[PDB]
Design an enzyme around this catalytic site. Structure first.
Site, PDB file in Angstrom:
ATOM      1  N   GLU A  12       0.857  -1.159   0.000  1.00 28.28           N
ATOM      2  CA  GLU A  12       0.000   0.000   0.000  1.00 28.28           C
ATOM      3  C   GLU A  12       0.890   1.203   0.000  1.00 28.28           C
ATOM      4  OE1 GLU A  12      -1.677  -1.292   3.627  1.00 28.28           O
ATOM      5  OE2 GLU A  12      -3.544  -2.038   2.706  1.00 28.28           O
ATOM      6  N   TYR A  15      -0.880   6.607  -2.147  1.00 29.36           N
ATOM      7  CA  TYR A  15      -2.125   6.865  -2.895  1.00 29.36           C
ATOM      8  C   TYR A  15      -3.077   5.698  -3.015  1.00 29.36           C
ATOM      9  CZ  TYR A  15       1.267  10.401  -3.940  1.00 29.36           C
ATOM     10  OH  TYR A  15       2.239  11.360  -3.819  1.00 29.36           O
ATOM     11  N   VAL A  18      -0.639  -1.192  -4.471  1.00 27.63           N
ATOM     12  CA  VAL A  18       0.305  -1.572  -5.521  1.00 27.63           C
ATOM     13  C   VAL A  18       0.211  -3.060  -5.715  1.00 27.63           C
ATOM     14  CG1 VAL A  18       2.757  -1.659  -6.289  1.00 27.63           C
ATOM     15  CG2 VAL A  18       1.942   0.214  -4.878  1.00 27.63           C
ATOM     16  N   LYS A  33      -0.374   0.345 -10.112  1.00 27.78           N
ATOM     17  CA  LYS A  33      -0.743   1.173  -8.985  1.00 27.78           C
ATOM     18  C   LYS A  33      -2.124   1.818  -9.193  1.00 27.78           C
ATOM     19  CE  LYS A  33       4.218   1.681  -8.361  1.00 27.78           C
ATOM     20  NZ  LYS A  33       5.198   2.186  -7.361  1.00 27.78           N
ATOM     21  N   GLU A  74       7.309  -0.379 -14.812  1.00 23.40           N
ATOM     22  CA  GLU A  74       8.328  -1.426 -14.792  1.00 23.40           C
ATOM     23  C   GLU A  74       8.411  -2.034 -13.393  1.00 23.40           C
ATOM     24  OE1 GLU A  74      13.258  -1.541 -15.096  1.00 23.40           O
ATOM     25  OE2 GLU A  74      12.240   0.390 -15.057  1.00 23.40           O
ATOM     26  N   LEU A  76      10.386  -4.180 -10.431  1.00 21.70           N
ATOM     27  CA  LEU A  76      11.683  -4.629  -9.919  1.00 21.70           C
ATOM     28  C   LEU A  76      11.410  -5.529  -8.713  1.00 21.70           C
ATOM     29  CD1 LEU A  76      12.488  -1.641 -11.368  1.00 21.70           C
ATOM     30  CD2 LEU A  76      14.706  -2.290 -10.435  1.00 21.70           C
ATOM     31  N   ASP A 120       9.801  12.848  -2.201  1.00 26.87           N
ATOM     32  CA  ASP A 120       9.525  11.840  -1.191  1.00 26.87           C
ATOM     33  C   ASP A 120      10.418  10.607  -1.296  1.00 26.87           C
ATOM     34  OD1 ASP A 120       8.267  10.958   1.114  1.00 26.87           O
ATOM     35  OD2 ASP A 120       6.640   9.972   0.108  1.00 26.87           O
ATOM     36  N   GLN A 124      12.078   2.612   0.759  1.00 25.15           N
ATOM     37  CA  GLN A 124      10.982   1.823   0.162  1.00 25.15           C
ATOM     38  C   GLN A 124      10.670   2.157  -1.292  1.00 25.15           C
ATOM     39  OE1 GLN A 124      10.919   3.328   3.144  1.00 25.15           O
ATOM     40  NE2 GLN A 124      10.501   1.737   4.679  1.00 25.15           N
ATOM     41  N   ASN A 125      11.099   3.315  -1.783  1.00 21.89           N
ATOM     42  CA  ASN A 125      10.888   3.611  -3.199  1.00 21.89           C
ATOM     43  C   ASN A 125      12.159   3.627  -4.075  1.00 21.89           C
ATOM     44  OD1 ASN A 125       9.477   6.938  -2.486  1.00 21.89           O
ATOM     45  ND2 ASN A 125      11.629   6.373  -2.790  1.00 21.89           N
TER      46      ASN A 125
END
Ligand SMILES: CC(C)c1nc2c(OCC3CCCCC3)nc(N)nc2[nH]1
Length: 291
Positions: A12, A15, A18, A33, A74, A76, A120, A124-125
Site C-alpha cells: 500500500e 495513494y 500496488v 498502482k 516497470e 523490480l 519523497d 521503500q521507493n
C-alpha cells in the site's frame, strides 16, 4: 484493467494499493498502482511517461477509466529497505553503497535537468535488481497528487528523509530537497541506522538540529524569516561527522556534509555530486539477492 491479471498485493503506497500484475497481451510482468478525474493530474503524469532514464523506474502506461487512474510501472524484485534489513548483520559493502549512491545521483541529475523533483525519497521507493542497478520509483507523483500525513490506509507517511526547508514551511522548495533525502539514505546505508527518525515534524526538526546544529543566519541566510521558524527553537551545537557516520572515510563524510547543507542554495547539486572525489574508484558490484 481487464488487460491485467493481479499476481499479488505488493503493498500500500501513499495513494493506493500496488499490485504485481501480468499484462494479458504483452505477457509483461508489471507494477500496477491504483491512484485514489483531475485534468491537471492527467497532464502531469503524461509528462512523466516521457522522462525516461536507466535509473528511473519506467512508467509504461497511464490508464484513466471510470473516474479511476491506474499507473503501470516497470517491475523490480526488491527494494532498498528490505535489502538493508537483510544486510543488517554485516552491512552493505562500501563499493555497493557507493555504486548505488552514484546511480541514484545520475537518476536525480537527469530528472532535475528537466526540472522534475521527487520530494519523497525513502528506502521503500528505491528499487534494485539482480544486475546491481538501483532505480528511483514514483518520481514526480508528489507534484501530481500531493503528500498527505496519512496514506489511504491511515499509515503514517515518514518524515525521516524530509528536508529542513520543507519542515520550516517553504512552499517553493527546489531539487535540493531530493539531495537532502539521498544524503539521509546514504548515512543509513553506512551506519545501518536511520539518521533522523522523527516521529513528528518538531521531533524531526529537532533531531536535525541536535546533529547538525540549530541553523542561524550565518549558515542559512533567510532561515529566521521562514514561516515555521520560531526564535524559541533551542540552540544546539553541531556534531562532527566523524561521530555521525563512522566508519565512512573522509571523501564520503565530505560528500555527505555537502548533501546535508542547511541552505538549499549551498547544498550540492546531483551533477556536482557525481564529480566528487568519493566517486573516483566507483564500480558496479552485483548484490546477492535471495528472491
Ligand atoms: C516486489 C516489490 C519489491 C516491488 N515494489 C515495487 C514498486 O512500488 C511499491 C512501493 C512503492 C513505494 C511505497 C510502497 C510501495 N514499484 C515497482 N515499480 N516495482 C516494485 N516491486
Amino acid at each position: 484493467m481487464e488487460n491485467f491479471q493481479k499476481v499479488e498485493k505488493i503493498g500500500e503506497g501513499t495513494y493506493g494499493v500496488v499490485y504485481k500484475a501480468r499484462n494479458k497481451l504483452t505477457g509483461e510482468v508489471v507494477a500496477l498502482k491504483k491512484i485514489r478525474v483531475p485534468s491537471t493530474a492527467i497532464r502531469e503524469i503524461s509528462l512523466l511517461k516521457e522522462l525516461n532514464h536507466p535509473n528511473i523506474v519506467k512508467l509504461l502506461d497511464v490508464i484513466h477509466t471510470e473516474n479511476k487512474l491506474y499507473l503501470v510501472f516497470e517491475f523490480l524484485h526488491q527494494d532498498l529497505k528490505k535489502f538493508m534489513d537483510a544486510s543488517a548483520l554485516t552491512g552493505i559493502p562500501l563499493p555497493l553503497i557507493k555504486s548505488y549512491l552514484f546511480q541514484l545521483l545520475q537518476g536525480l541529475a537527469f530528472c532535475h535537468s528537466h526540472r522534475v523533483l521527487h520530494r519523497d525519497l525513502k528506502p521503500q521507493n528505491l528499487l534494485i535488481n539482480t544486475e546491481g542497478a538501483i532505480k528511483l520509483a514514483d518520481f514526480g507523483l508528489a507534484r501530481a497528487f500531493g503528500v498527505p500525513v496519512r496514506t489511504y490506509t491511515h499509515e503514517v507517511v515518514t518524515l525521516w528523509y524530509r528536508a529542513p526547508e520543507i519542515l520550516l514551511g517553504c512552499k517553493y522548495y527546489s531539487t535540493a530537497v531530493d539531495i537532502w533525502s539521498l544524503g539521509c539514505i546514504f548515512a543509513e546505508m553506512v551506519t545501518r541506522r536511520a539518521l533522523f527518525p522523527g516521529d513528528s515534524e518538531i521531533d524531526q526538526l529537532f533531531r536535525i538540529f541536535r546533529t547538525l546544529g540549530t541553523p542561524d543566519e550565518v549558515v542559512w541566510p533567510g532561515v529566521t524569516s521562514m514561516p515555521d521558524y520560531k526564535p524559541s527553537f533551542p540552540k544546539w551545537a553541531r556534531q562532527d561527522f566523524s561521530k555521525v557516520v563512522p566508519p565512512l572515510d573522509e571523501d564520503g563524510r565530505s560528500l555527505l556534509s555537502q548533501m546535508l547543507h542547511y541552505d538549499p542554495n549551498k547544498r550540492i547539486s546531483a551533477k556536482a555530486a557525481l564529480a566528487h572525489p568519493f566517486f573516483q574508484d566507483v564500480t558496479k558490484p552485483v548484490p546477492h539477492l535471495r528472491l
